[PDB]
Design a protein around this ligand. Structure first.
Ligand SMILES: OC[C@H]1O[C@H](OC[C@H]2O[C@H](OC[C@H]3O[C@H](OC[C@H]4O[C@H](OC[C@H]5O[C@H](OC[C@H]6O[C@H](OC[C@H]7O[C@H](O)[C@H](O)[C@@H](O)[C@@H]7O)[C@H](O)[C@@H](O)[C@@H]6O)[C@H](O)[C@@H](O)[C@@H]5O)[C@H](O)[C@@H](O)[C@@H]4O)[C@H](O)[C@@H](O)[C@@H]3O)[C@H](O)[C@@H](O)[C@@H]2O)[C@H](O)[C@@H](O)[C@@H]1O
Ligand SMILES: OC[C@H]1O[C@H](OC[C@H]2O[C@H](OC[C@H]3O[C@H](O)[C@H](O)[C@@H](O)[C@@H]3O)[C@H](O)[C@@H](O)[C@@H]2O)[C@H](O)[C@@H](O)[C@@H]1O
Ligand SMILES: OC[C@H]1O[C@H](O)[C@H](O)[C@@H](O)[C@@H]1O
Ligand SMILES: [Ca+2]
Ligand SMILES: [Ca+2]
Ligand code: NA
Length: 700
């Protein structure tokens, strides 16, 4: 009676230079009561070939987990993905990708850091960076809102760097915490990108060395500078002209200060997106999107000059779509290391998004593409607990304003001593996003004290709404919980203010079905997705700190598989010589399973691609779902034993048919029995796909 499982498999770096040693670690647990002794096998593949094998015998104590390590000298050829497979027999097996790349910008897998707390220890910094690297092969990190001011990024008193500073949303940021994270990025061979704006400065900028003449204005008479109003009569961003060389000088020196003082590898340059009828200080009207490429290219050569090992840069093409505002300009002319675009509502369907990605590749000579595409945005999804069915304390149920869910809500929630108290029951250990749906027409922000299992947690704000029947679910707070039952109590306490009605509490939950389909479509079209950060947090909103949704562990497990898959098969997905095969949907036939070539809803979408060495067919299962990438989705209709025919040239050479999927068998390639044939439609290759859930790739 011998038993156990392989819990985790990871490498010591997210990215290796050719010829670097790779340490591959299997975290193996003996679940038996007595110590196990046996052989642990390592098998490393590159696509369909087995390129290395290794063995060791190892003794693991009963109830213990032990790190089983192998070492491997990466082959000397650059830009190669590999799959490492550890097999411990009765104690299970596990895989991880190895990425050999001298330049991460060829295969960016971009995460984020948004938390810089003085109380973050260096263990905590390291652990969050290590988790993203080990689990999802993250090789670059966008540091969001690390800076003090948009124009004065590091806060100094004299020539001393202050220890902490307060950012635009009143968050305390530590310099040491930023540094420790940057260091930990660098121990993973990761690149640390420093968030910055192309053209923003904070209020009172004239006293920080920034001339108002450099600005951009809504009129010809410099009356009204373009700005972002944060709604408190002091906190503003003011905008400037990216073509102004005096502004370029000022802000490019900030970028350099950031590289040289903090150790950042480059700059993640952001912008607000489309602006019209923009003038400079003198009333000369600007072709605004044409000002970006010159700013970026000048920023790039200034970086390279400063430090050519830390000259990285990207620019956010906001509101991405084919021929979108600034899109052709940047992709076509800007010297960014990889392309980045935040997708809003002009590429809502899978096919529109595919076409946008294809266009970026075609303008750019196939630069890598990273998409910011905030999944399940605004949807109040998860387990719901209606407030009317909660335990009430000097509060009551009612239903005299519409917009509630269930049968009613709680009101008479306006006095110290009042409280609502939910009994939630959760399936597993981890983060839960407490999302409150509520009404407040008090004229101003109300507050309530949240308690969790009787202990105080935090004061929550509840913004004011136009009426008592306009509801909001913008009040959230994330908490970590053990499995089972827990007490979540909103309470009116002395020092809290306003009044509210409480519809419900939802445990904000990212939907795996939609997220696996989006990631599959993106990789299959040659793009990756910025979505993971911190300690397996996921972006819910464009303000990266927003924790209104949490991932459950099935989603974490599936993203681990997916990110490893797109690393191990990076050569069939992201190399510049990976191209759509001509023609369309008449190349591929699935017998008795409705199918499309164009991401038609409720179909198995097949997409044919080619390298000089390989023919690639992607199968993405949209059965039981629509053609929109963002919104939560149903579990796809599972398919089994699908008789497939792929039509080929007579020209084409074929000595095997190979199958890999992030949904099955730990990303391992499987060799499929096939036949060649000829019918009226042309020459074909015929095989059976054992199954199709979210995404499967065949190559030959
Ligand atoms: O999480 C940090 C907070 O933690 C504590 O409080 C937790 C509570 O936070 C909120 O409530 C307090 C909040 O209330 C009001 O704001 C509501 C609003 O807050 C958040 O969003 C803020 C804004 O985010 C963006 O703008 C900031 C962004 O602007 C520039 O960047 C431009 C962006 O646009 C491009 O398209 C880019 O691609 C993109 O990447 C860019 O971000 C700038 O360069 C950046 O530096 C800057 O960060 C967005 O544009 C705005 O629309 C947002 O308003 C929430 O995420 C959002 O859902 C919500 O609507 C109030 O006005 C504000 O002052 C207060 O901070 C939550 O609502 C609440 O649930 C939670 O309990 C702590 O107490 C806080 O101090 C801390 O902030
Ligand atoms: O039993 C209570 C204990 O459990 C949790 O630990 C899980 C979590 O803890 C660490 O991270 C702390 C903190 O790091 C950053 O600041 C992140 O941005 C935050 O999301 C995060 O909470 C650890 O390093 C993580 O790997 C791990 O996921 C609680 O969160 C603990 O505070 C608590 O003591
Ligand atoms: O008039 C608006 C009113 O809304 C509610 C508040 O609790 C109260 O103090 C305020 O006067
Ligand atoms: Ca309700
Ligand atoms: Ca959908
Ligand atoms: Na069919």
């Amino acid at each position: 009676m011998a038993s156990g499982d392989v819990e985790r498999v990871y490498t010591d770096k997210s990215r290796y230079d050719p010829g670097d040693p790779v340490t591959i670690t299997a975290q193996v647990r003996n679940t038996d009561s007595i110590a196990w002794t046996g052989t642990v096998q390592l098998r490393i593949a590159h696509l369909e070939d087995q390129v290395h094998t290794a063995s060791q015998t190892v003794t693991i104590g009963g109830g213990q987990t032990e790190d089983v390590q192998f070492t491997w000298t990466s082959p000397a050829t650059d830009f190669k993905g590999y799959l490492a497979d550890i097999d411990a027999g009765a104690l299970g097996s596990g895989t991880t990708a190895i990425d050999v790349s001298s330049d991460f910008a060829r295969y960016p897998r971009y995460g984020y850091v948004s938390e810089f707390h003085p109380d973050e220890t260096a263990a905590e910094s390291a652990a969050k960076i290590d988790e993203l690297a080990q689990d999802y092969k993250i090789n670059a990190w966008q540091f969001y809102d690390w800076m003090w001011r948009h124009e004065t990024m590091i806060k100094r008193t004299g020539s001393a760097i202050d220890s902490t500073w307060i950012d635009l949303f009143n968050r305390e940021i530590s310099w040491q915490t930023i540094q420790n994270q940057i260091d930990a990025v660098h121990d993973q061979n990761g690149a640390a990108m420093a968030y910055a704006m192309i053209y923003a400065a904070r209020e009172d900028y004239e006293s920080y060395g920034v001339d108002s003449e450099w600005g951009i204005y809504q009129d010809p008479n410099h009356l009204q500078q373009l700005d972002v109003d944060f709604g408190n009569n002091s906190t503003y961003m003011y905008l400037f002209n990216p073509a102004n060389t005096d502004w370029q000088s000022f802000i490019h020196a900030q970028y350099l200060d950031a590289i040289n003082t903090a150790g950042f590898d480059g700059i993640h340059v952001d912008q607000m997106g489309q602006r019209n009828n923009v003038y400079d200080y003198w009333g000369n009207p600007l072709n605004f999107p044409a000002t970006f490429t010159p700013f970026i290219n000048e920023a790039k050569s200034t970086l390279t000059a400063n430090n050519s090992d830390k000259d990285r840069i990207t620019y956010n093409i906001v509101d991405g779509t084919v021929d979108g505002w600034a899109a052709n300009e940047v992709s076509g002319g800007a010297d960014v290391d990889f392309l980045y675009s935040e997708i809003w509502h002009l590429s809502d369907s899978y096919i529109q998004l595919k076409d946008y990605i294809d266009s970026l590749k075609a303008n750019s000579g196939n630069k890598a593409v990273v998409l910011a595409a905030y999944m399940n945005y605004r949807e109040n999804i998860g387990d719901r607990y209606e407030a009317e069915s909660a335990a009430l304390t000097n509060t009551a149920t009612n239903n005299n304003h519409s917009g509630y869910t269930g049968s009613g809500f709680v009101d008479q929630f306006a006095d110290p001593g009042d409280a609502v108290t939910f009994s939630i029951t959760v399936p597993e250990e981890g983060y839960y996003s407490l999302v409150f749906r509520f009404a407040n027409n008090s004229g101003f922000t109300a507050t309530r004290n949240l308690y969790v299992d009787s202990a105080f947690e935090i004061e929550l704000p509840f913004q004011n709404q136009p009426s008592w029947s306009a509801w909001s679910h913008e009040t959230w707070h994330q908490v970590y919980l053990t499995p089972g039952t827990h007490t979540i109590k909103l309470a009116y306490d002395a020092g809290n203010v306003g009044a509210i009605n409480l519809d419900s509490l939802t445990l904000g939950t990212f939907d795996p079905h939609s997220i696996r389909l989006a990631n599959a479509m993106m990789a299959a079209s040659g793009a990756t997705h910025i979505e993971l950060g911190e300690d397996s947090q996921m972006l819910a909103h464009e303000y990266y700190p927003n924790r209104s949704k949490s991932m459950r562990s099935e989603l974490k497990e599936a993203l681990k598989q997916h990110y490893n898959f797109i690393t191990a098969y990076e050569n069939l997905l992201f190399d510049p010589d990976v191209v759509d095969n001509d023609s369309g949907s008449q190349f591929v036939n699935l017998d008795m399973v409705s199918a499309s070539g164009d991401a038609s809803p409720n179909t198995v979408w097949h997409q044919v691609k080619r390298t000089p060495e390989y023919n690639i067919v992607h199968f993405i299962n949209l059965a039981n779902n629509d053609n929109q990438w963002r919104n939560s989705a149903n579990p796809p209709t599972l398919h089994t034993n699908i008789a497939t025919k792929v039509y080929v040239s007579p020209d084409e050479t074929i000595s095997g048919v190979y199958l890999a999927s992030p949904d099955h068998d730990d990303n391992r390639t499987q060799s499929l029995a096939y036949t060649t044939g000829t019918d009226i439609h042309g020459d074909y290759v015929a095989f059976t796909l054992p199954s199709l859930e979210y995404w499967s790739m065949v190559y030959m």
